[PDB]
Each structure stands twice: as structure tokens, then as C-alpha cells.
Amino acid sequence: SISNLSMQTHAARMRTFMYWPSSVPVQPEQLASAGFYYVGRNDDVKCFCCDGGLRCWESGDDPWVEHAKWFPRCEFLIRMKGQEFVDEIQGRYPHLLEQLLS
Amino acid sequence: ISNLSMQTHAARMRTFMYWPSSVPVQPEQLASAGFYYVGRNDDVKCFCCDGGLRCWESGDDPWVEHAKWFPRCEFLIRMKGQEFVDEIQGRYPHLLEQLL
Amino acid sequence: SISNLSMQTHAARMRTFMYWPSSVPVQPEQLASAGFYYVGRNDDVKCFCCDGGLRCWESGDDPWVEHAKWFPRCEFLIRMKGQEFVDEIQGRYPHLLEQLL
Amino acid sequence: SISNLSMQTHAARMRTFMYWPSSVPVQPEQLASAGFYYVGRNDDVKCFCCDGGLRCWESGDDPWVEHAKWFPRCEFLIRMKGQEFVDEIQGRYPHLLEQLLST
Numbered sequence: 001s002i003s004n005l006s007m008q009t010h011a012a013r014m015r016t017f018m019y020w021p022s023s024v025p026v027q028p029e030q031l032a033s034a035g036f037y038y039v040g041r042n043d044d045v046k047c048f049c050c051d052g053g054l055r056c057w058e059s060g061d062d063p064w065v066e067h068a069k070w071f072p073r074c075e076f077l078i079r080m081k082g083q084e085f086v087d088e089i090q091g092r093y094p095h096l097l098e099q100l101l102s
Numbered sequence: 103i104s105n106l107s108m109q110t111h112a113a114r115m116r117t118f119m120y121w122p123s124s125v126p127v128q129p130e131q132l133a134s135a136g137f138y139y140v141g142r143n144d145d146v147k148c149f150c151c152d153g154g155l156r157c158w159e160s161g162d163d164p165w166v167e168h169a170k171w172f173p174r175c176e177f178l179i180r181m182k183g184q185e186f187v188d189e190i191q192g193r194y195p196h197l198l199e200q201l202l
Numbered sequence: 203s204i205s206n207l208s209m210q211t212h213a214a215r216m217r218t219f220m221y222w223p224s225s226v227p228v229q230p231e232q233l234a235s236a237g238f239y240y241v242g243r244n245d246d247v248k249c250f251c252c253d254g255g256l257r258c259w260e261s262g263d264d265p266w267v268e269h270a271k272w273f274p275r276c277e278f279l280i281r282m283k284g285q286e287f288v289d290e291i292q293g294r295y296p297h298l299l300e301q302l303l
Numbered sequence: 304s305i306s307n308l309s310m311q312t313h314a315a316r317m318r319t320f321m322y323w324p325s326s327v328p329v330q331p332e333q334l335a336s337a338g339f340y341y342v343g344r345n346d347d348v349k350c351f352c353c354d355g356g357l358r359c360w361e362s363g364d365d366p367w368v369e370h371a372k373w374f375p376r377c378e379f380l381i382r383m384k385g386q387e388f389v390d391e392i393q394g395r396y397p398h399l400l401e402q403l404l405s406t
């Protein structure tokens with residue numbers, strides 16, 4: 001499964017970060033390596049695989065952890081990081097839903 | 103308790119006076135599940151967990167929706183039990199994934 | 203045309219204010235006189251005539267002024283207060299739509 | 304006055320419309336030309352100048368008319384379209400606030 005066939009390569013994902021804001025603390029290298037490509041609005045990124053979108057990147061935020069925290073069933077994440085890493089992150093944040101709503 | 107004035111079924115039933123007739127879910131089922139009318143659209147809130155629900159359709163059950171979205175509500179647990187809350191959570195394991 | 207025929211009379215509008223919160227600064231007498239009846243949730247009121255709803259009543263808020271501010275074309279408000287009042291209030295608040303956006 | 308200094312240029316507004324839904328009948332060219340940029344949720348757009356937001360675009364909807372219909376005091380709209388255009392649009396829709404409180 002792949003949601004965006006044109007963003008399947010790191011090189012293509014890196015090309016979308018041309019007009020990425022300089023002010024954003026997270027670097028485009030860490031983002032593209034985690035399967036994300038720039039979408040052209042704010043600091044909005046999407047995964048070429050799971051179509052999962054992330055935004056509001058702050059200092060210290062890691063793209064792989066955020067990818068595991070919000071989109072744990074992404075096939076690309078699982079292939080790269082493994083099931084142990086995804087289980088560990090899901091365990092650290094057991095009330096994502098409760099928190100979004102509360 | 104998030105709303106001390108909505109503790110009683112009678113008080114929750116009073117809010118549904120000018121509830122739309124077009125909405126398929128009846129105020130009797132809603133107030134019994136801890137919900138009171140919020141005065142906008144078909145928006146309801148639980149007096150206990152402050153959890154809000156809207157967009158009620160034909161066949162939607164207030165206790166099951168309360169269990170899907172707000173499973174740690176003390177009122178829902180006291181009335182329906184941990185088995186019900188667990189069974190509903192098992193039927194809907196990708197709720198977050200659904201909305202995202 | 204009247205939106206609620208059962209709330210035509212001041213007496214009927216006053217009866218809806220039975221479970222009205224004591225904490226609300228605006229009194230049910232001022233509200234019912236301005237065509238409003240309680241809708242049974244929060245401090246939400248509706249006019250029997252134009253079906254216009256108001257809420258979040260604070261200290262000093264006048265029901266007749268708020269009626270002209272938000273629902274100026276209400277036949278009841280026009281009959282009771284007149285076109286001069288409605289016009290004067292509409293002149294004081296010329297950017298209401300802009301204000302809420 | 305300008306609410307978003309980074310969206311001052313047509314080029315910058317056009318860049319936000321990359322992953323805009325194909326299903327939406329109104330084209331990003333008309334939108335960006337009317338001062339709007341893509342916000343990133345639904346078909347939600349905002350004016351770089353007046354911070355006025357619009358959504359639920361349907362077939363036949365014109366961005367300049369909607370801009371005049373909802374945000375008539377926007378300096379950018381006035382400079383581009385003129386006071387005659389804004390006045391005519393305000394005249395066709397005299398009960399906008401009322402229409403919201405009714406529907």
C-alpha cells in the first residue's frame with residue numbers, strides 16, 4: 001500500500017521542502033527520512049504511504065516518534081522502525097484520544 | 103462531576119424542551135445516558151465527564167456512543183459496568199485512526 | 203407571522219422562567235416584556251414572534267436593545283418600540299456581522 | 304494593514320493550493336487572485352489582508368463576489384475591485400446577518 005506514488009523516494013520528498021519555513025525547529029532531512037513530504041501550507045507534512053498528516057513542529061520533536069504516536073499502523077513506519085518501537089511509543093501515550101477530546 | 107446542576111435525570115430532561123423533532127435519537131435515551139442538551143444543533147454533553155456528542159443518526163445508541171468516545175467516564179462505568187465499556191472498545195479499536 | 207402562538211402572552215412567557223438561573227444578572231420580567239421566553243437550557247431565550255434567540259446575558263444588558271441589535275425586522279419589536287428606536291440601535295452597531303467574524 | 308505578511312504575493316498564495324481537493328468546483332487561480340490562501344483543512348481559505356475566512360465552495364461561486372459579500376471593508380478587496388463593485392454586491396445581499404440567524 002502507497003497513498004502517493006510520486007513521493008515514494010527520499011529525493012522527491014526533499015524537493016517539496018524548497019519553500020519550507022526557516023523558523024520551523026525540525027529539519028527537512030529528519031522529516032523526509034520518516035516518509036513525510038511538504039504540502040505547501042504552514043508546517044503541514046503528509047506520509048507518502050499512510051497519508052497521515054502532522055503539523056505544529058516544536059523544538060525537540062522527532063518525526064519517527066510522532067509518526068508512531070499518531071499513525072502506528074503505517075506499513076512504511078513498521079518496515080523501517082519495527083513493531084517494538086511502535087509498541088513502546090504507543091505505551092508512552094495511552095490516552096491520545098482522551099487528550100484530543102479533553 | 104463536571105456539571106453539578108445536571109446530576110439528576112429531571113434536570114437533563116428539562117434542557118430537551120426545544121430539541122429538534124427531526125433528530126432520530128429521542129431525549130429519553132440521551133438523558134438516561136447522562137447527556138443534557140447544549141442549545142446548539144444536536145450537541146449534547148455528559149454531566150460527569152464533560153464529553154460532547156453530535157450528528158445523531160437513525161439507530162445510534164447513546165450508551166454505546168458514550169462507551170466508544172468517553173470510556174473512562176465514572177458515570178458510564180457505574181451504570182453500564184467495565185464489561186460493556188471493554189466490549190464496545192473491542193468493537194471500535196481504530197477510533198483515533200478513523201478521525202485522523 | 204408569529205413563530206410561537208402559545209408564547210403570545212406575557213403570562214405564558216413568565217411561566218417558562220420557573221427554572222431560570224438565579225446567577226443570571228438580567229431578570230425574567232425584562233425578558234418576557236421584550237417578547238422572550240426561556241428555552242430550558244443555559245440562559246437561552248427565544249422571541250415568540252421572530253424566533254430570534256439570545257444567550258450570555260451580563261450585568262447591564264437590556265433585552266429591548268439586544269432585540270433591535272440582533273433582530274431589527276421583528277414585527278413585535280417594531281410595534282412596541284417603534285422604527286426610531288430600532289434605527290438608533292442599528293446606527294450604534296453598524297458592524298455587527300463584521301464583529302462576530 | 305495586512306494580517307499575513309507572508310501571503311502578500313500571488314505566488315505564495317498559489318503554493319498553498321498544491322494539495323487542494325480536486326473535487327472543489329472553484330479553481331485556485333480565482334481564489335489566490337482574490338487574496339485567498341489555503342488554510343489546510345477542508346476547502347477553508349483566508350484573505351492575507353482582512354483575515355476573513357470562507358469555505359463550502361460550490362459550482363458557480365465567484366471568490367471576488369464572496370469576498371465583497373462577507374468582508375466588504377477589506378482594504379485589498381476595495382483597492383482591486385473598487386467601492387462600486389462592493390456596494391452593488393452589498394445591495395444584492397441586504398440581509399446577510401439575518402440569513403445566518405434564520406438558517
Ligand SMILES: CC[C@H](N)C(=O)N[C@@H]1C(=O)N2[C@@H](CC[C@@H]1CCN)CC[C@H]2C(=O)NC(c1ccccc1)c1ccccc1
Nearest residue numbers: 039044045046053054055056057058061066070201202343
Ligand atoms: C508533530 C508534532 C506536534 N507537536 C504534534 O504532535 N502535533 C499534533 C498533530 O499534528 N496532530 C494530532 C493533533 C495534535 C497536534 C496538533 C498541534 N499540536 C492529530 C494528528 C495531527 C494533526 O492535527 N493532523 C492534521 C493534518 C492534516 C493535514 C496535514 C497536516 C496535519 C489533521 C487535522 C484534522 C484531521 C486529520 C488530520
Ligand SMILES: CC[C@H](N)C(=O)N[C@@H]1C(=O)N2[C@@H](CC[C@@H]1CCN)CC[C@H]2C(=O)NC(c1ccccc1)c1ccccc1
Nearest residue numbers: 100101140145146147154155156157158159162167171201
Ligand atoms: C453520536 C453519534 C454520531 N454519529 C457520532 O459518533 N458522532 C461523532 C462525534 O460526535 N464525536 C467524535 C467525532 C466523530 C463524530 C462526529 C460526526 N460523526 C469525537 C467526539 C465527538 C465530537 O465530535 N464531539 C464534539 C462536541 C463538542 C461539544 C458538544 C458536542 C460535541 C467535540 C469537538 C472537538 C473536540 C471535542 C469534542
Ligand SMILES: CC[C@H](N)C(=O)N[C@@H]1C(=O)N2[C@@H](CC[C@@H]1CCN)CC[C@H]2C(=O)NC(c1ccccc1)c1ccccc1
Nearest residue numbers: 141246247248255256257258259260263268272302403404
Ligand atoms: C444578549 C446579550 C449578550 N451579551 C449577547 O449580545 N450575546 C450575543 C448573542 O446572544 N447572539 C449573537 C452572537 C454574539 C453574542 C453571543 C455571546 N455574547 C448572535 C445572535 C445571538 C446568538 O448567539 N444566538 C444563538 C441562540 C440560539 C438559540 C437560543 C439562544 C441563542 C444562535 C447561535 C447560532 C445561530 C443562531 C442563533
Ligand SMILES: CC[C@H](N)C(=O)N[C@@H]1C(=O)N2[C@@H](CC[C@@H]1CCN)CC[C@H]2C(=O)NC(c1ccccc1)c1ccccc1
Nearest residue numbers: 302303342347348349355356357358359360361364369373
Ligand atoms: C464561499 C461560498 C460559500 N457557498 C459561502 O458563501 N459560504 C459561507 C461562508 O463561508 N461564510 C459565511 C457563513 C455562510 C456560508 C457557510 C457555508 N455556506 C460567514 C463567513 C463564512 C464562514 O463561515 N467563515 C468561517 C471560516 C473560518 C476560517 C476559515 C474559513 C472559513 C468562520 C466561521 C466562524 C466565524 C468566522 C468565520
Ligand SMILES: [Zn+2]
Nearest residue numbers: 047049050074
Ligand atoms: Zn505513514
Ligand SMILES: [Zn+2]
Nearest residue numbers: 148150151175
Ligand atoms: Zn460521561
Ligand SMILES: [Zn+2]
Nearest residue numbers: 249251252276
Ligand atoms: Zn422578536
Ligand SMILES: [Zn+2]
Nearest residue numbers: 350352353377
Ligand atoms: Zn480580505
